[PDB]
Design a protein around this ligand. Structure first.
Ligand code: PMP
Ligand code: PMP
Lengths: 412, 412
């Protein structure tokens, strides 16, 4: 895995911000795209754009073939059994909302429980809040360990015989924690619950095997894995998807339409209403081809190296707090003592470095951490150890700057 | 308006299918894109892709500026009062589903009525079926005239004091009918109902003024108006959107998130959950710039010329039936006597001509027309009268071919 050869394919990396070479460390917010993906979109719009689900003309046939072949690429990518289990959506948020609407709100009675965690992204919190409110069920939270991980015994304690759904993140976009998804799946199944995996942060950076995880549902976003914006995937076990009603209604998802009643298509098109995200889905397939040619295990090893290096170099900094465990994905969420993270991000961008500051759409996690906001640098396959050196040097410069600005008007 | 200069900007038009120059007459299924839109997507992914809703780094600021500027472009394009009334969605289908979920299902009691028409696309039928089923309300249909138009007195007869929603198409993708949207809006308001305009087929081809139409909701799709796939718009009057609950929940649309309760953002972000369709929305803004530079009135005049020419030349054909009125948008839906429309589309594609065959996602309209399927050729700003000549010549050739294949084995 040659990182220079990889960076060469991402045109956006080769520019300056504020007179400094761009150092993009915000891939958890969104990832950048290689030329393969952009040129896939270009070839689609230049050569064979047409509405899909063929039968009539040539460009329509080519568009349909591209779209459904991207579906098959996704099926192979996460090791789903059937294309009927692969639903193209707007993103992770929409997929989780679909599960909450068509599964949760249809399978929850008073006394039932939906169990989530304190580290969940808002996308994996608010749909369940609304579903339990609509059904009169109960929302429960699995507590976290001191290092930001989840113990299996806390899972067994929180999940009960009344738990119908356990919704959990595969990888936390804040803590870097990789949750024991497989063991949690078996624990949930032992109590008669299904499991809903938020895999927005796992899918871009590590191999996904839905058959080995035995997840009942799995959600992912294209924009985080070198793919186009506005497209994502809902995977669900075919037996569960067959008994769920559609979340959206309209053309393409119908079979027979009467004046007052209608019948739906078979999976997966039952859950894809209207003209689909054709170009975006084909580009997501191109992104999958790109990542597979590089190898997800290679990318994960590279990110392990980056994360270990970054954790050590952060521990070389005085007055910096890092949140989460030692064993982690490729990201570091932190805070400088007596410097607000927003100012940290501002100064870093002045140095050309792109990080994120705020709650990272995980307010309950922020309150569990006893902070209002944090700063975060996230890595991907195009990032290098030199960029982490620049990051820690800029953090030291920031510490010194806000220190001596403080001492100067103390004297004044 | 120079049609050669316009065609020069669409690379996909300059290719051959089955050894014949491409003749794309399927723009009602989807439209093709100029270089301005494709290169807008390219510049986004090459230069300033980042997650939006800024505050931290430079590329994020540029991405946010592009996204919200596209929102402002849309507001100007349809003459909405405020950007708070412009919601980016997945497409027309999703926008109509949002209105049916968050307005209809919250404002319908038994005895209430939702009134639609027989010419409606499935996107403007099935959500209302499901909403009236969920609320115990009643679905009603406005009858059609013999020429496929809607009389205002039939509207006054169907809409009653119990009608809460009137959902109607601005332009029929099958009949070519332009419905009297403004008069229907006032009729609906006189009875205490809101009006929901399906403008997927109107927006690409004619000027939209939501303040002059006085539509309560208006839906549109980017892929039909030279814009990227997977993005559309829901417009709704700000006063109605303020009292509607969100259709989706997650990050970006929240303000405060507690363990069990949450508060929403102000409009329009209340209705945009998760990472939005950044590139697609910016490209839709580019498509709006393109169409405005050409001029929607110019495009509408060109399509009027094309439609009149096509209707005359179709009337020069023996044994061909055309459906709809004389005054129409730029499309012709038809049938050849004793030739199934699917065979018509097949032969036409063999001649390089791209038309559509089937129900066009309007099965109740097909049954009203007393046919099972039809063929359809739809026009846009890059189509010419020479292409219509090729179409009618291929239809005559098809008539003669299926005639003499029939006579040859009659003799055999
Ligand atoms: C008149 C009409 N209504 C609504 C739709 C559905 O729009 P979409 O598939 O983009 O969601 C279509 C499909 N072209 C249409 O032409
Ligand atoms: C872990 C996690 N969960 C879910 C989401 C939401 O995904 P999206 O905004 O693409 O819908 C995010 C946002 N990056 C995330 O990182």
């Amino acid at each position: 895995m040659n990182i220079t050869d990889i960076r060469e394919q991402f045109p956006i990396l080769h520019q300056q911000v504020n007179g400094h070479d761009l150092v993009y460390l915000d891939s958890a917010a969104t990832s950048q795209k290689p030329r393969a993906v952009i040129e896939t979109l270009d070839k689609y719009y230049n050569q064979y754009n047409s509405n899909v689900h063929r039968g009539v003309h040539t460009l329509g046939t080519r568009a349909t073939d591209g779209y459904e072949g991207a579906r098959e690429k996704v099926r192979k990518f996460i090791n789903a059994k059937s294309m009927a289990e692969i639903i193209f959506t707007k993103g992770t948020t929409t997929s989780l909302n679909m599960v909450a609407l068509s599964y949760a709100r249809a399978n929850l009675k008073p006394g039932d429980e939906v169990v989530i965690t304190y580290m969940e992204h808002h996308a994996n919190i608010i749909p369940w809040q609304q579903a339990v409110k609509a059904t009169g069920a109960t929302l429960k939270y699995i507590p976290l360990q001191e290092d930001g991980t989840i113990s299996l015994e806390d899972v067994r304690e929180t999940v009960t015989s009344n738990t119908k759904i356990v919704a959990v993140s595969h990888v936390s976009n804040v803590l870097g924690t990789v949750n024991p998804i497989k063991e949690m799946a078996k624990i949930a199944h032992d109590n008669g619950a299904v499991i809903v995996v938020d895999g927005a942060q796992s899918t871009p950076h590590m191999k996904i095997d839905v058959q080995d995880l035995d997840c009942d549902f799995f959600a992912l976003s294209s924009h985080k894995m070198c793919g186009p914006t506005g497209v994502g995937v809902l995977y669900g076990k075919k037996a569960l998807l067959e008994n769920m009603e559609p979340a959206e209604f309209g053309g393409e998802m119908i079979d027979f339409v009467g004046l007052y009643e209608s019948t739906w298509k078979e999976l997966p098109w039952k859950f894809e209403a209207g003209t689909p995200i054709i170009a975006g889905a084909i580009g997501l397939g191109a992104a999958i081809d790109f990542l597979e040619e590089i190898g997800l295990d290679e990318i994960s090893r590279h990110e392990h190296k980056l994360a270990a290096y970054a954790l050590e170099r952060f521990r070389q900094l005085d007055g910096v707090t890092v949140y989460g465990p030692e064993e982690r994905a490729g990201l570091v969420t932190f805070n400088l003592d007596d410097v607000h993270p927003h100012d940290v991000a501002t100064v870093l961008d002045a140095e050309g470095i792109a990080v994120r500051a705020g709650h990272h759409c995980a307010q309950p996690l922020m309150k569990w951490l006893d902070v209002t906001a944090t700063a975060r640098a996230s890595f991907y396959l195009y990032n290098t150890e030199e960029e982490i050196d620049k990051l820690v040097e800029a953090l030291q410069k920031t510490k010194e700057y806000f220190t001596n600005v403080f001492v100067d008007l103390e004297h004044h």
